[PDB]
């Protein structure tokens, strides 16, 4: 069939540069031509516009003139899209796709399933830097719980970027976890919960400790959650 | 110049459904219409090409409708996998550019409602002697995935310092979310008490701290 891979995911600051690649196999690279498409976080779909695959010559949607540009490397069978200034706004996920056959069996194209779009690249723009989080305890508390249980937590507070790791106990404690997505605040820094329910006879007799882990600032974090 | 379409639609398993596409007479009548689902962390998929025509792999329960100024996507026999994205899409012969729908969000309600479970932690004591207070309010065990959150200051609103995250599919199917109050430890114990307000369903949940 018709493949396209892209590549994997980006972080930039605004003002940057990115190249994001979009290689296609198992067809005649000239047969179908290359469309852009990018999608905003909880947003629709913007055609950015089209490269011609035998010619080389691109079609940019208006607005994108100029801090866009499509490139191709035929021999590799390879479509670029280069995008310069970043701005936050062009956060987002980044397809490449077929595009129908501007004469010759159209129909075809359509039938056999020769229309596909490549998994996306997702493009992340950020002002932060790398930060570890400030994990904070979340003191139990029996009123939102079950009978003889006590919910507590650990705040996992302003780190950059995704992802962390939460675990209770050394791995020892998995029954009743619940770890929440992340927000992203206004500062471009994420925060993220992880609550557990226990037995309210375990308190001050069982100890809790959440262990946290941020690869990318190279932060581990156990946090004790005492009773107050 | 623009493919309208309504934001969401929605329906119970077996039921039938009807998305809108609205147009012109220089992008719609006269160029062909397509049809796109795009399902949670995936690319779109075409379901139907050239108005109404169903390419290899589509179910018969979708299909496609065209007017002279307006398009429809009709679902028969409608299942929890439906749940997605759709979008209309044709060419603009004048500007020589695709244009796309703004998409319509479709919900299946595949299970009963369920409430939501609210547990609402006050800063912590280490927070406050870093000179920050942020108040926790998670919201869990909830159906359909969707969710309003409000904070207050003793009796009043707060808009300043709230960040509420979009629902999330938890492992039992029900969905999840979080909101955050950014305070300062002056604000924190100046107030009487702090609340978060969750309504889902006509149903509200509020439950209060206080320093």
């Known amino acids: 069939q018709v493949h396209l891979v892209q590549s994997g995911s980006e972080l930039k600051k605004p003002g940057a540069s990115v190249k994001v690649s979009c290689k296609a196999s198992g067809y005649s690279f000239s047969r179908y031509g290359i469309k852009w498409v990018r999608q905003a976080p909880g947003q629709g779909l913007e055609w950015m516009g089209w490269?011609?695959?035998?010619?080389?010559?691109?079609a940019y949607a208006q607005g994108f003139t100029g801090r866009f540009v499509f490139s191709l490397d035929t021999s590799v069978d390879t479509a670029f899209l280069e995008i310069s200034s970043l701005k936050t706004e062009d956060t987002g996920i980044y397809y490449c796709?077929?595009?129908?056959?501007?004469?010759?069996?159209?129909?075809?194209?359509?039938?056999?399933?020769?229309?596909?779009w490549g998994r996306g690249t997702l493009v992340t723009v950020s002002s932060a830097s790398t930060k570890g989080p400030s994990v904070f305890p979340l003191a139990p508390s029996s009123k939102s719980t079950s009978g003889g249980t006590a919910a507590l937590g650990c705040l996992v507070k302003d780190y950059f970027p995704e992802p962390v790791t939460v675990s209770w106990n050394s791995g020892a404690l998995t029954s009743g976890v619940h770890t929440f997505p992340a927000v992203l605040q206004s500062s471009g820094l994420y925060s993220l919960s992880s609550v557990v329910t226990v037995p309210s006879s375990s308190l001050g007799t069982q100890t809790y400790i959440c262990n946290v882990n941020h690869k990318p600032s190279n932060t581990k974090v156990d946090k004790r959650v005492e009773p107050k | 110049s623009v493919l309208t379409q309504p934001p969401s639609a929605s329906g119970t398993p077996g039921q039938s459904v009807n998305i809108s596409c609205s147009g012109s007479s220089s992008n719609i009548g006269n160029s062909y219409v397509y049809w796109y689902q795009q399902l949670p962390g995936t690319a779109p998929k075409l379901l139907i090409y050239?108005?109404?025509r169903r390419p290899s792999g589509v179910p018969d329960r979708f299909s496609g409708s065209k007017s002279d100024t307006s398009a429809s996507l009709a679902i028969s026999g409608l299942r929890s996998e439906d749940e997605a994205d759709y979008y209309c899409?044709?060419?603009?012969?004048?500007?020589?550019?695709?244009?796309f729908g703004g998409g319509t969000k479709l919900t299946v309600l595949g299970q009963p409602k369920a409430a939501p479970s609210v547990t609402l932690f006050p800063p912590s004591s280490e927070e406050l002697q870093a000179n920050k207070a942020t108040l926790v309010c998670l919201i869990s065990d909830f159906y359909p995935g969707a969710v309003t959150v409000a904070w207050k200051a003793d009796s009043s609103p707060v808009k300043a310092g709230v960040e509420t995250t979009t629902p999330s599919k938890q492992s039992n199917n029900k969905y999840a979310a979080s909101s955050y109050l950014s305070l300062t430890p002056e604000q924190w114990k100046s107030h009487r008490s702090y609340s978060c307000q969750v309504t889902h369903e006509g149903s509200t949940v509020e439950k209060t701290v206080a320093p």
């Open positions: 796709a077929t595009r129908p056959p501007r004469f010759y069996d159209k129909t075809e194209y359509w039938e056999d399933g020769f229309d596909v």
């Open positions: 899409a044709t060419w603009d012969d004048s500007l020589s550019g695709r244009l």
């Open positions: 490269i011609n695959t035998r010619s080389g010559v691109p």
């Open positions: 050239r108005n109404n």
